[PDB]
Write a protein that binds this ligand. Structure first.
Ligand SMILES: C=C[C@@H]1[C@H]2CCC[C@@H](C(=O)N3[C@H](C(=O)O)CC[C@@H]13)N2S(=O)(=O)c1cc(Cl)cc(Cl)c1
Length: 127
């Protein structure tokens, strides 16, 4: 399914080139500009665990998740990944635990050593 496909066919977007965050662009967004550090970004997403189960969705809340890019307000992979996206883009990310919640996990929902899958849509970004 999509998680396997991004695992096997995604692009490494890490600066370290350690394959910790792999990406596929599913829908190409608008123009060439990606957000800048400190921008307010508006995103819809769905996340899955490696047990095959959905663990979260902003779509199901009927409103996007909003954060300031590049400030550690989210897991490292999200800061890295959303920074590569254009407005209107939909992407898949496959994230090893070193760029997510690590050995600690995040109780109750995220186990130790969890690889995470997201479908993410960048709705908007603003200074
Ligand atoms: C609103 C929740 C966000 C979502 C969406 C952005 C990525 C990631 C994350 O960086 N989060 C921040 C954090 O941990 O400081 C705040 C809480 C959490 N998660 S998440 O999808 O990985 C996530 C969802 C749930 Cl239900 C629970 C947890 Cl711990 C993480």
């Amino acid at each position: 399914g999509a998680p396997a496909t991004v695992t096997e066919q995604g692009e490494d977007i890490t600066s370290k080139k350690d394959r910790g965050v792999l990406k596929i662009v599913k829908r190409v967004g608008n123009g060439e500009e990606t957000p800048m550090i400190g921008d307010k970004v508006y995103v819809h997403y769905k996340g899955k665990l490696s047990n095959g189960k959905k663990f979260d969705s902003s779509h199901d809340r009927n409103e996007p998740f909003v954060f300031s890019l590049g400030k550690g307000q989210v897991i490292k992979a999200w800061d890295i990944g959303v920074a590569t996206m254009k407005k209107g883009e939909i992407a898949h990310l496959l994230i090893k635990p070193e760029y997510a919640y690590g050995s600690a996990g995040s109780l109750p929902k995220i186990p130790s050593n969890a690889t995470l899958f997201f479908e993410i849509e960048l709705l908007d970004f603003k200074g």
